[PDB]
Swiss-Prot record:
PANTHER family: UBIQUITIN CONJUGATION FACTOR E4 B, UBIQUITINATION FACTOR E4
InterPro entries, per the entry: Ub_conjug_fac_E4_core, UBE4, Ubox_domain, Znf_RING/FYVE/PHD
Miscellaneous comment text of the record: Present with 2600 molecules/cell in log phase SD medium.
Keyword set includes Cytoplasm: yes
Keywords recorded for this protein, A-Z: Cytoplasm, Nucleus, Transferase, Ubl conjugation pathway
Lineage top rank: taxon: Eukaryota
Entry GO terms, CC: cytoplasm; nucleus; ubiquitin ligase complex
Domain notes: The U-box domain is required for the ubiquitin protein ligase activity.
Family label: Belongs to the ubiquitin conjugation factor E4 family.
Identification of the protein by name: E4 ubiquitin-protein ligase UFD2
Free-text function comment from the UniProt entry: E4 ubiquitin chain-elongation enzyme specifically involved in polyubiquitin chain assembly. Binds to CDC48 and elongates mono- and diubiquitinated ERAD substrates presented by the UFD1-NPL4-CDC48/p97 (UNC) AAA ATPase complex to a chain length of 4 to 6 ubiquitin moieties. Delivers these polyubiquitinated substrates to RAD23 and DSK2, which target them to the proteasome. Has E3 ubiquitin-protein ligase activity, accepting ubiquitin from its cognate E2 ubiquitin-conjugating enzyme UBC4. Enhances ubiquitination at 'Lys-48', but not at 'Lys-29' of the Ub moiety.
Domain called U-box: residue spans: 866-937
Amino acid sequence: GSEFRSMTAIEDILQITTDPSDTRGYSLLKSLGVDFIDTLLLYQLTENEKLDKPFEYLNDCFRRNQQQKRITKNKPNAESLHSTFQEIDRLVIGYGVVALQIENFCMNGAFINYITGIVSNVNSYTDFLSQIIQRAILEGTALDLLNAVFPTLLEYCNKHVSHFDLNESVIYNNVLTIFELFVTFKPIAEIFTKIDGFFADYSCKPQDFERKTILGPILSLSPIEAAVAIRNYGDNLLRSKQQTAMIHESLQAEHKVVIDRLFFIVDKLVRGSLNSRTDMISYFAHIANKNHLRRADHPPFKELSSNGFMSNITLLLVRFSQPFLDISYKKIDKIDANYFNNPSLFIDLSGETRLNSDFKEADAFYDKNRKTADSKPNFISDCFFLTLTYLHYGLGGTLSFEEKMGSEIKALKEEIEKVKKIAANHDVFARFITAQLSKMEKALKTTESLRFALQGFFAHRSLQLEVFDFICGASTFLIRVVDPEHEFPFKQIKLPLIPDQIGVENVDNADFLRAHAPVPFKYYPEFVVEGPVNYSLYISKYQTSPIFRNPRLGSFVEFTTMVLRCPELVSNPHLKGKLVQLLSVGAMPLTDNSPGFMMDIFEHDELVNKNLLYALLDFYVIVEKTGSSSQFYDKFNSRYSISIILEELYYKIPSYKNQLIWQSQNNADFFVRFVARMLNDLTFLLDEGLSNLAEVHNIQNELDEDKELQTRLASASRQAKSSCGLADKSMKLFEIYSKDIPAAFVTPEIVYRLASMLNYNLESLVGPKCGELKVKDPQSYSFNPKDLLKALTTVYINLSEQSEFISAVAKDERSFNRNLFVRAVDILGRKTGLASPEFIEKLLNFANKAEEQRKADEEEDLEYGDVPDEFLDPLMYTIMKDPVILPASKMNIDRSTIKAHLLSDSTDPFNRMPLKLEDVTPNEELRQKILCFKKQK
């Protein structure tokens, strides 16, 4: 009849009949109408041993029932078919839910098998699952649905695949699909973080975070995973830049999609509920808290999370932050500056060096804040600071890992070549050496493959741009934390924060500065500044650096300049050393000889151009008083950098050239402090650069204990290139500067020392000291003797019409001899870079005027020079009667003279230090000779 059309439709949907003779492969059951289909089902699922895939079945049913409809509605007869089509949907989905809720309610297979099927062809369980989910939430039970499909998805990703990575294109892509599908339902999102095993096992090792944790496997999908790296590049490491660049574009494309989907998933979880996003922060916090050694010198790699894993989480956190740090800076208040005021609840700051303070101080500062709430985890700002801690330990850890690769590869190739030369006679030894060699080759492949993979990741513009932008945004935020009246970047900031030390000549400001450092900023963890700098100096080597002409550079260049301007902000000089090195990268002229990419900001950025020059000159001096256990060559590398910036700022930006000159006239004490250090260093630089250079030969010599004999030669040549380098760059500054302000270089405290330094180096450059040196390839160590001799002589010439200077050069007994200038011309007449002969002529004029004056004094003495100089008063020039030793300068002077000087001045005539005619210790011993002389003769 028609109550038949029902029993018939139930047959073709559930594929099961009752007549032992059916013309179709329907299951026969053995042991009503539509109240009988619940019974039919419970059987197919708990009795029929022929059903190995209960779930794949329930889905095919649901799948056919939904087709019976797509054709039953296109007919006039379609009514009693609704009474049934409905009870199907009620029990197919209703059971589909028990399948994924009760471990083994089915006859064949368990959770693992069903979700394995789902993962295989996911687009076919999409509708059914969707319905199973809705069912779950409406009926209450949903956590149970999750505790069945996700811990399982984890076991599947770990044990039922060979490797869950970017190579299993279908499997990972489908596993993400079931994450999205499942998490786009908000009632799930607000509960997701409760799933068994969503957190680390409190005994779980950091390498397993991305393995035994729910979000583990998918957060790791990335192209900088060894497996992917060798599959894609280890394939042919000899391919061309074109083909290489090809696979890079490809992998980049794939990664952009995976982090976009990765974000999508965690964003839904963050929006789920305060309890969820808080849990998301805890999860990420714990991962970071236990991966600090990722940033160690020799990281225990197999005991730490993967670079892919940590790098992705960084890109993610950089996105949850993008909103607060957009160029309008309107939301910049949601980030609590006092974040570090109370003990932390997530990021573990124990053992974290702070900007300008220490443990006792930070711990104590916690107490001065007892009366405020401890647990007030503002998400917005936990996210921000977690991003910074990840920028350091995650991205920072990854970037350092690749920077060291070239040097690793060199060493490996050398090692295998050594091993390759061994001749193993005995079969067991021959088999041994081959294994040794084999393992080394495998290591090499892994590294070269990884190097390409990693290179394609930092060269992935789109992604790196999100990172630097975060940095620039974070910069602006930190400036506001320093700014007394926290209002930057709305209301500008006034530097210096505390008046500059006119009296900077005191006991290590170290303690004074720390005491006057900004109340909140001083307690901030150091990584907040190291992270941005390390990354920035790093990606700067990339053709696609995000930093290049990025419209937000100013925000960073400002923060940098501020730190370099107020010594109390960050105490670590090694750190500020990096900052000054970055600035030098943005000063270097493009090969188009056009201004560095940072030159424009240097010139027009209000904050920058007002404090840059001063900061550089003050820091040039401040690094001297430092170093920390052979962190000795930092002060010189920091100066090499400052020099570069100084040389360029002077050539290309009148604005700065003016400030220099100004500084020298309106603040000579400060400008002299600077040139004085540049002067001192120049007395020995060329000397040791020359000595380290002699060694980089005494070592290449014994090369017809090597291991350390070679690390010694590599330390020697580095100190050479570093010394000859600063030498050349410092002479250029004396040349350049003397041309416009010769007066500044003839002040009493600089002139005599300046003359002696010049004659001394001139002696080196013109004689055997440089003339016998036989270095491999000069240029490699920044050693251009002839170019340096030119900057030297040009300096003489820029000062030659300064009486005091020519006088000094003439009186320098130690190393002045006109002949030196002679052969200086003669050997400047070798390579043609001598702006001569008008130069070679200007030089000889000086060389003679000096010789003139020299003889004038040698005779002036011989004739009217009886009374030995030590018996003469320094200010009255008469013979001394009551010799007395000043104590502040050890200068001898007549009782009468100081006594008479004192009447209107209680300072020492020479070195301006207070005193009283009492502190003046008489000098009898002297007045002794002053008699047997004043009498004898």
